[PDB]
């Protein structure tokens, strides 16, 4: 009752706020609105009169209270100040987000905030905000950001969860989990939980397509469930069963039994890619699955299955894993075939390097790793849980590495170095993120290792040496490394702080085709000096540039409406490139140092009198007190 | 920085100070590039001399020098321009004694400080050696020249540092002008002569520099030898033990222990010590490395004596008398 | 006026010194007397009294019949068990092994009390059977317990926590050391008597002998069996240095070490298991150094626990310190234990890496501390009770100025003459040879 009626209210409000007429007797029309109105108000009444047993905690009813009561005089768009209505309800659901006995699904929270954050207003200040304190942006950063991770989010929402992430990082200096995570492993856990197997898995996705979807969706979905808890009961399959008793609830698993009748034959309606150069098709997890799928007739939970993986979009990316383990599981004693084919078209799978089959390959990874965690039947030790298929550990660990999964990598090489009883190991060292994993590798000495190992350290003067040394006997004897020897020194004297010494290293330079360290680097000293004249790139994914654009128009700007717009701007085009996806930890960091150094910014323009200076003073000393022990880098 | 970001008119001052701390260390790429930045050149003398000796280390042989200066760094730099763009050795011979003529009538000039006096003594120096060499006829006269090199640096061991720093960057420039110049050589000077005479040279002024303890020009040095190995192997010559231990040298002097001994240790292995130019003695380097290990703990001291003490107590094959066997 | 305004830290002191010794018993049992008559601790004392006394009650009874090791017994047969239930529930405190931290504003009543106890108790293996209660608090945590009786002395292995603890202290105040979280895990040792106490039972770990020995016959089962490893190196005990060595490396071609799965069978999710292998290695390094400096000797398998929740190493039953170890029949003659299987559990990077960085901050920042260790160390000096030698009792229960010596050998290794670089690559040396590893104990599983 919670999710429908914010849902419906939510819709009703919308409806009732838009007036456009024009097939419709103009007379009708208020015929109808009346009519809104009035089952709006009856249902509001009933709201407020409702109370449950059922409630958990009290908890949980003061926030079905506010939940309902606050969506009752909501708008037709939301704001984040503090005491309106939407703000309320805001902050409502975005507190019941993260909690373990939450109210709403997720279906009706897509669409209450769809209908507040579609058009947005965010404060310019930072008193009237509805989060203005260290501690709310600490406790709500996690959940803020997992809202802002949907496409239908206008501009200023986008600007709003930046501040907020910004707040929470610069008064904590710690990332929400949700950017370090690299592999689905959750996902699969948070499905597959209670019994832990396949079977429940594939029931809870199908459970949530039943309220998450359209007509069709829903349809085939309960369907699909209708033949399986039929079959299940009929032929008193104790496993299959329960794993239904425990997807699913006690409503849905009445509904779905045909006690005093028969499975009718309109549900039950049936619908190369085992090969390389099939990885690039964006349908390959979906051909493939259902090739699996229908390879296992006698396993119920799989025959139902090609009707949802065709027809549903991003259905058979979710259910890849749980498919290919009740296949590979099912015919373990008989002829073992797809576990045949699969291991030998990996091996041309994992050798892919590619932009359009990087995004097939992170699930072929995920499904190994998956497969990794379930137990075989008849083993002595998780040793044998390389049985399931039979990868090539040296080739998956390559293959993680180009996908940017670091810790999967790592695994993997260490399964393969198992496997035998140190090229990937380098790229792996490199960007794990740890401060001493590095140098543990060993490779062959020289003075230029030497050198690699110092600017990986970033050290100051140490690295300036043997970069000067190799930076004259370059340009003495006319080679051409003496580019990259430039731009490194760019680099270590820009992580040193003498700026005088990186600006005049980079005039001199008139090729400036230096991935984009160049392209960080030209704004970084340009704002250290006060330079603010340089024409900025548009459209960068770089948050030098960023910073830079906010100080600039900080400099040549008469009101503060316009500086405000270009901090917004900023918090906005930042948030989207966090939301971008492949990043490692160096940028990512980076990236949220500068929304933190935006929301600093936007704290001291808003100043009004002698006391908030003094406050924004307080703030200062209080971040110190966690900068004193954090990372180098963002503080 | 605080006075480029102030807008303040003393950074010129600043950066003319910047540019003779460079010119001290031997980061001459990073003070070439704070020269062409700097547009009004007006900073007494220092800057004259700053734009010269640049020059002559990155080797840019195309500046108009001015003419009746009072700066050592203009002569040396017009006799080795000179040296570029000249085809026969009388041009430069006639350089090389315009520079020691006026050299004399500036130390004649009388009101000149101990510096400048002595910065103008290690011109006549640099000039009186590169005409030493441009004057060689056969292989003895170049042998005799090395040893000259190893006398006069027996005095300059515990000489003053400013002298001995200049006198031997003129002397690098020097040994690799004589070596790409082909045509001013004599009949009998190959080119593998020219180049193993630069090597013999260069290393003679790492000992020189190690112990003045200048660790920027050990690092110059041993990266200047460092490339000078593929063209070195092109001409005929197995030159690379010696490169790299002086590379290790350099590293070990720098505080890498694990770097530089895993670099012995590469050149132990894979080399062959015997059949090679600059020669190197594996009971040298095997002490070396023992001693280094030692030093740092590397391995248990019944290691040390098993893989690299009794070894070269046994590469010495009887000989119990030399520095080598002392060693 | 300690034990008045926090009575949860002197009031357990002042009951074990009452119940030059006849004098500090009379002051001691002044202060109790004291105690039990002002009001703001009197509903203290007495609870404090009666538990104490029905706990150690509790530890002293042993009966071979009553009390089968490795059983699990209902504490409410025995008239001893129904005693302690009754005067539990009928005074209330917190768990005795529970570490309260001290309040400054002298409010100690958010401390969870013991609400009651779990029916049964589990029994562990020896003589005076060690029993394992469990106690539900109010808060609904459980805090299991080891109610240790005996002829043990625990107040040995308290003083010497209570050290370790204060030097892992030390180690916040450096930049390297603070920013990894470089310290120890610890736990609370409680002297009842001179022959019982309670120690604090570690909430989810699990003794590295008892993974160790399992699964190495579950992951290699052609190999020798940890008994017959420690048979095959026991009956060489009584020979040359050649034969043991010659004995030892016999038995370890036939050993293959297999702690790496410890954590790819807890943690299967690489994030996880990356931070929880990181995590174990820190701990080690940290300890390894800590236990250098202050000579921790008998790190045998059974004093080190695995916690399968975080990864981190423990180390329990810290009181053969100050290089008591190498005065043994057969010494102990390691810095630390840096076995095969140690070092295993640390990847394809065995030592160089993680392991060896964190070994050179730990010992860095501990040589920048010698004063504080100093003083620490002096206050051990005038603590009367405390032994600096190791008594024959427990030099036979291990193996089937005496201060101004411990307190300079402790002095000399934190000199700064060799780099720390050096100092680490030495340990390290002569931590993993196989002639060092070879004439240890064969109950110090070295082989493992
Ligand atoms: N405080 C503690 N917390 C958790 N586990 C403990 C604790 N003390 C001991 N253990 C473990 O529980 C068991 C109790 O060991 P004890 O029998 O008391 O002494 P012991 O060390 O096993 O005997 P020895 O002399 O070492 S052979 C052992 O397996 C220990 O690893
Ligand atoms: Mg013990």
């Not at chain 1, 993680?400 to 399964?415: N, P």
Request: proline share 3%; net charge neutral.
């Amino acid at each position: 009752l919670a999710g429908y009626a914010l849902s419906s209210l939510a819709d009703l409000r919308v409806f009732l706020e838009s007036s456009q007429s024009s097939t419709t007797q103009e007379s009708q029309f208020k015929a109808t609105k009346s009519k809104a109105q009035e089952f709006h108000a009856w249902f509001s009444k009933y709201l407020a009169a409702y109370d449950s047993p059922e409630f958990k905690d009290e908890g949980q009813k003061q926030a079905f209270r506010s939940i309902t009561e606050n969506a009752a005089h909501i708008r037709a768009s939301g704001n984040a100040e503090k005491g309106t209505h939407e703000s309320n309800l805001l902050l409502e659901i975005l507190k019941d987000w993260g909690r373990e006995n939450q109210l709403l699904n997720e279906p009706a929270r897509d669409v209450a905030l769809s209908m507040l954050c579609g058009v947005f207003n965010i404060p310019p200040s930072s008193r009237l905000d509805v989060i203005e304190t260290d501690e709310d942006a600490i406790k709500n950063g996690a959940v803020v950001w997992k809202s802002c991770s949907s496409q239908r989010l206008g501009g200023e929402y986008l600007a709003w969860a930046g501040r907020v992430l910004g707040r929470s990082f610069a008064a904590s200096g710690e990332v929400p989990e949700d950017l370090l995570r690299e592999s689905q492993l959750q996902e699969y856990r948070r499905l597959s939980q209670g019994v832990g197997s396949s079977e429940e898995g594939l029931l809870n996705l199908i459970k949530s397509l039943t309220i998450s979807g359209d007509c069709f969706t829903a349809g085939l979905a309960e369907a699909a469930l209708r033949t399986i808890v039929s079959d299940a009961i009929s032929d008193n399959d104790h496993d299959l069963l329960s794993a239904c008793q425990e997807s699913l609830p006690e409503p849905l698993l009445i509904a779905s039994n045909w006690d005093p009748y028969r499975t009718p034959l309109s549900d039950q309606f049936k619908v190369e890619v085992f090969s390389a150069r099939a990885l690039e098709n964006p349908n390959w997890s979906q051909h493939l699955a259902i090739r699996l799928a229908l390879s296992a007739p006698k396993i119920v939970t799989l025959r139902v299955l090609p009707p949802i993986l065709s027809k549903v979009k991003g259905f058979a990316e979710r259910a890849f894993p749980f498919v290919v383990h009740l296949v590979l599981a099912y015919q373990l004693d008989k002829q073992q075939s797809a576990k045949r084919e699969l291991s030998e078209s990996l091996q041309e799978w994992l050798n892919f390097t590619s932009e359009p089959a990087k995004e097939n390959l992170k699930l072929l990874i995920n499904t190994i790793l998956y497969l990794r965690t379930q137990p075989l039947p008849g083993e002595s030790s998780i040793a044998d849980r390389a049985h399931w298929l039979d990868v090539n550990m040296a080739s998956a660990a390559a293959a993680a590495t180009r996908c940017g999964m670091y810790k999967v990598a790592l695994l993997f090489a260490e399964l393969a170095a198992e496997s035998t009883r140190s090229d990937i190991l380098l790229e792996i060292f490199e960007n794990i993120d740890d401060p001493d994993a590095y140098y543990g590798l060993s490779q062959d000495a020289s003075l230029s290792t030497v050198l690699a190992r110092l600017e990986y350290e970033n050290d100051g003067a140490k690295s300036l040496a043997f970069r000067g040394a190799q930076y004259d006997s370059h340009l003495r004897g006319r080679d051409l490394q003496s580019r990259q020897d430039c731009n490194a020194l760019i680099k270590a004297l820009s992580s040193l702080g003498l700026a005088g010494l990186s600006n005049s290293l980079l005039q001199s330079q008139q090729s400036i085709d230096g991935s984009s360290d160049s392209l960080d680097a030209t704004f970084t000293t340009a704002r250290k000096l006060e330079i603010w004249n340089l024409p900025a790139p548009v459209n960068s994914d770089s948050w030098a540039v960023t910073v830079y654009k906010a100080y600039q128009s900080m400099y040549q700007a008469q009101e503060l409406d316009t500086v405000r717009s270009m901090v917004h701007d900023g918090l906005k085009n930042t948030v989207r490139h966090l939301s971008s996806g492949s990043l490692n930890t160096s940028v990512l960091r980076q990236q949220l140092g500068a929304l933190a150094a935006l929301t600093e910014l936007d704290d001291i323009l808003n100043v009004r009198d002698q006391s908030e200076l003094q406050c924004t003073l307080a703030t200062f000393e209080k971040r110190s007190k966690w900068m004193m022990s954090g990372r180098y880098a963002d503080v | 920085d605080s006075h480029l970001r102030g807008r303040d008119l003393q950074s010129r001052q600043d950066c003319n100070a910047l540019i003779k701390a460079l010119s001290s260390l031997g980061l001459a790429g990073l003070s070439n590039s704070l020269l062409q930045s700097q547009q009004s050149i007006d900073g007494s003398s220092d800057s004259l001399d700053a734009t010269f000796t640049t020059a002559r280390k990155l080797e840019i042989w195309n500046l108009p020098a001015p003419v009746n200066s009072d700066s050592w760094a203009v002569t040396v730099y017009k006799a080795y321009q000179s040296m570029y763009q000249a085809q026969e050795l009388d041009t430069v011979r006639s350089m090389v004694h315009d520079g020691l003529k006026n050299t004399v009538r500036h130390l004649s000039s009388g009101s000149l400080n101990t510096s400048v006096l002595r910065q103008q003594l290690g011109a006549l120096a640099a000039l009186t050696e590169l005409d030493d060499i441009l004057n060689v006829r056969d292989q003895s006269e170049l042998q005799c020249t090395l040893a000259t090199f190893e006398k006069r640096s027996k005095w300059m061991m515990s000489g003053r540092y400013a002298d001995v720093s200049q006198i031997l960057s003129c002397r690098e420039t020097t040994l690799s002008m004589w070596s790409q110049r082909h045509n001013l050589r004599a009949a009998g000077l190959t080119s593998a002569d020219a180049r193993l005479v630069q090597i013999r040279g260069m290393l003679l002024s790492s000992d020189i520099f190690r112990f003045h303890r200048a660790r920027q020009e050990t690092l110059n040095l041993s990266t200047a030898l460092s490339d000078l190995i593929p063209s070195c192997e092109s001409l005929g010559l197995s030159v690379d033990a010696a490169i790299k231990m002086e590379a290790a040298n350099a590293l070990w002097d720098h505080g890498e222990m694990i770097s530089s001994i895993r670099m012995l240790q590469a050149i132990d292995k894979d080399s062959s010590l015997k059949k090679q130019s600059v020669p190197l003695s594996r009971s040298d380097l095997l002490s070396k490395i023992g001693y280094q290990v030692s030093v740092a703990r590397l391995e248990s001291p019944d290691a040390i004596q098993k893989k690299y003490l009794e070894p070269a107590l046994k590469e010495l094959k009887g000989k119990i008398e030399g520095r080598e066997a002392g060693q | 006026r300690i034990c008045v305004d926090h009575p949860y830290h002197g009031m357990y002191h002042i009951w074990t010194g009452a119940r030059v010794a006849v004098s500090r018993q009379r002051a001691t049992d002044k202060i109790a007397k004291a105690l039990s008559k002002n009001n703001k601790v009197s509903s203290i004392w007495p609870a404090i009294d009666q538990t104490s006394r029905v706990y150690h009650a509790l530890a002293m009874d042993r009966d071979p019949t009553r009390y089968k090791s490795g059983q699990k017994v209902p504490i409410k047969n025995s008239p001893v068990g129904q005693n302690f239930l009754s005067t539990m529930s009928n005074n209330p405190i917190p768990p005795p092994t529970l570490q309260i931290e001290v309040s400054a504003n002298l409010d100690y009543s958010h401390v969870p009390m013991i609400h009651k106890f779990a029916p049964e108790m589990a029994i562990a293996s020896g003589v005076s059977a060690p029993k394992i209660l469990t106690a539900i608090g109010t808060d609904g945590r459980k805090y299991k317990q080891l109610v240790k009786g005996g002829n043990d002395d625990l107040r040995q292995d308290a003083i010497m926590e209570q050290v370790f603890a204060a030097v892992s202290e030390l180690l916040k105040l450096h930049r390297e050391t603070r920013q990894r979280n470089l310290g120890i895990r610890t736990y609370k040792v409680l002297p009842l008597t001179s022959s019982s106490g309670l120690i604090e039972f570690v909430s989810n770990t699990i003794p590295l002998h008892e993974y160790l020995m399992p699964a190495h016959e579950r992951y290699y089962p052609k190999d020798l069996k940890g008994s017959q490893c420690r048979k095959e190196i026991a009956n060489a005990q009584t020979k040359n240095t050649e034969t043991r060595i010659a004995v030892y490396r016999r038995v370890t071609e036939r050993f293959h070490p297999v702690m790496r799965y410890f954590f790819m069978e807890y943690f299967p999710d690489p994030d996880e298991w990356f931070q929880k292998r990181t995590n174990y290695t820190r701990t080690t390094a940290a300890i390894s150094m800590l236990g250098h400096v202050l000579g921790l000797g008998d790190r045998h398998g059974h004093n080190i626990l695995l916690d399968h929740k975080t990864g981190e190493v423990v180390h329990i039953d810290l009181g053969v310190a100050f290089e008591m170890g190498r005065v043994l029949p057969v010494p102990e003659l390691v810095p630390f234990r840096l076995t095969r299987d140690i070092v295993d559990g640390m990847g394809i990077t065995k030592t160089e890496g993680v392991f060896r960085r964190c070994c050179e901050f730990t010992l860095d920042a501990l040589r920048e501390e010698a004063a504080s260790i100093q003083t620490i160390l002096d206050s051990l000096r005038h603590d009367t009770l405390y032994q600096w030698s190791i008594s024959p009792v427990r030099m036979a229960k291990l193996q089937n100025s005496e201060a101004d010596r411990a307190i300079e050998v402790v002095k000399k290794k934190l000199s700064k003459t060799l780099s720390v670089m050096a100092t680490v690559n030495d340990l390290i040396n002569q931590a993993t040879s196989v002639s060092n590893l070879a004439v240890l104990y064969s109950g110090w599983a070295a082989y493992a």
